[PDB]
Structure formats: C-alpha cells, structure tokens
Amino acid sequence: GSHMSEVHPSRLQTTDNLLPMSPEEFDEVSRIVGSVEFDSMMNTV
C-alpha cells in the first residue's frame, strides 16, 4: 500500500485545489500524452 517509510511530511500549503482539470479529464490526457518526458517539462532541454 506504499513505496516509502516517512512518518509525516515537512511542508504543506493551501495551493492544492486551484486544479483546472478533473480526474476523468486528467486520465484521458494521461492516455494520449503517455508521460513522454513529463518530469522534465520545466527544464526545456
């Protein structure tokens, strides 16, 4: 049911509900995008 051993986080904020797209929409986006280089979009290389 997990992949880590951390007892609790170290930072949190209310900036987690601005979300412009729904879980069903995000799932259909994920199918087409197929996570190409997704964890590198901020690095532009």
Q: Does residue 19 touch another protein according to CB under 8 A?
A: yes
In the complex, minimum distance from the CB of residue 4 to another protein, in angstroms, rounded to a whole number: 12
Q: Does residue 6 touch another protein according to CB under 8 A?
A: no
Q: What is the dihedral of CA 25, 23, 30, 10, to 10 degrees?
A: 140
Check if the beta carbon of residue 13 is closer than 8 Å to that of residue 21.
Answer: no
Token pair of 37 as six digits: 């280089």
Q: How many residues bind another protein (CB under 8 A)?
A: 26
Question: Which residues here bind another protein, judged by CB under 8 A?
Answer: 15-16, 18-22, 24-33, 36-42, 44-45
